[PDB]
């Protein structure tokens, strides 16, 4: 529980929708996803990189993973937004504020830390990475919440619950075959 991306999400929670107090666990599943998808990528990247000796986790390392991780369609936009991001992000220069230049108010330093402490493998984390991870998260993180957010409120309650996720997750076959994280609360699809 510690702190999780509660705060920043809370900012992507009010922004994505003003009526979204979000269910704690829905904040755990997303957080677990956001945390698990953060690993799935940074894991394979750190994998094809630990074996390639590349060590320098660059956009190309996470891109491939993203491409091998995400079914593809999601990737297509995950790499499109991630690229255009390094551009506007680097267009100026790291001389203003990464937590504002990256164009993503998502934990740029804390995640960059998840790459330093978790990888701790001579991972310099060139600007060609930390951002690709904050870009793909705000993309799918804001997406999962956008579907269930605008739907959970148009369906019955602003306080979404693992159920609206049962659909937003088990509904989108692609994500499902990609998230399959837990849904141990609303995933009332198999046993009744």
């Amino acid at each position: 529980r510690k702190e999780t991306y509660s705060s920043y999400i809370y900012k992507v929670l009010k922004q994505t929708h003003p009526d979204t107090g979000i269910s704690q666990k829905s904040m755990s599943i997303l957080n677990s996803f956001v945390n698990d998808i953060f690993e799935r990528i940074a894991t394979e990247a750190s994998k094809l990189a630990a074996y390639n000796k590349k060590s320098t986790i660059s956009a190309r390392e996470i891109q491939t993973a993203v491409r091998l991780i995400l079914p593809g369609e999601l990737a297509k936009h995950a790499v499109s937004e991630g690229t255009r991001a390094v551009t506007k992000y680097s267009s100026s220069t790291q001389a203003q504020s990464s937590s504002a230049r990256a164009g993503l108010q998502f934990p740029v330093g804390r995640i960059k830390r998840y790459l330093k402490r978790h990888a701790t493998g001579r991972t310099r984390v060139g600007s060609k990475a930390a951002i690709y991870l904050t870009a793909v998260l705000e993309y799918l993180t804001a997406e999962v919440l956008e579907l269930a957010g605008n739907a959970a409120k148009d369906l019955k309650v602003k306080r979404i619950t693992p159920r609206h996720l049962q659909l937003a997750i088990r509904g989108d076959d692609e994500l499902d075959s990609l998230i399959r994280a837990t849904i141990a609360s609303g995933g009332v699809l198999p046993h009744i």
């Binding site: 705060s7 320098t56 660059s58 956009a59 190309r60 891109q63 369609e73 297509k76 936009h77 790499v79 499109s80 937004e81 991630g82 690229t83 255009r84 390094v86 551009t87 992000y89 680097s90 220069t93 790291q94 504020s97 990464s98 937590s99 504002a100 934990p107 740029v108 330093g109 804390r110 960059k112 830390r113 330093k116 991972t123 310099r124 984390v125 060139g126 600007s127 060609k128 930390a130 951002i131 870009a135 705000e138 993309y139 804001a142 997406e143 956008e146 579907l147 605008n150 739907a151 148009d154 369906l155 609206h164 049962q166 659909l167 937003a168 088990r170 509904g171 989108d172 076959d173 699809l189």
Partner: protein
């Protein structure tokens, strides 16, 4: 707790003090291609009328 949080800002450095390849300019700026068709991270659309009916009309037709 907080006192000047707001993005913190004083984080990406204290941690990326590693120096960072600095190739920031050569980050990538090229792979762009499907950015003129697929779009998101701003206002996706789907709703996904629950009732499970969509969980099937989708888990089969989609």
């Amino acid at each position: 707790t907080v006192e000047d949080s707001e993005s913190d800002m004083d984080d990406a450095k204290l941690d990326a003090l590693m120096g960072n390849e600095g190739e920031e300019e050569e980050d990538d700026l090229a792979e762009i291609d499907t950015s003129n068709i697929i779009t998101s991270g701003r206002r996706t659309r789907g709703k996904v009328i629950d009732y499970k009916k969509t969980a099937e009309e989708l888990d089969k037709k989609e």
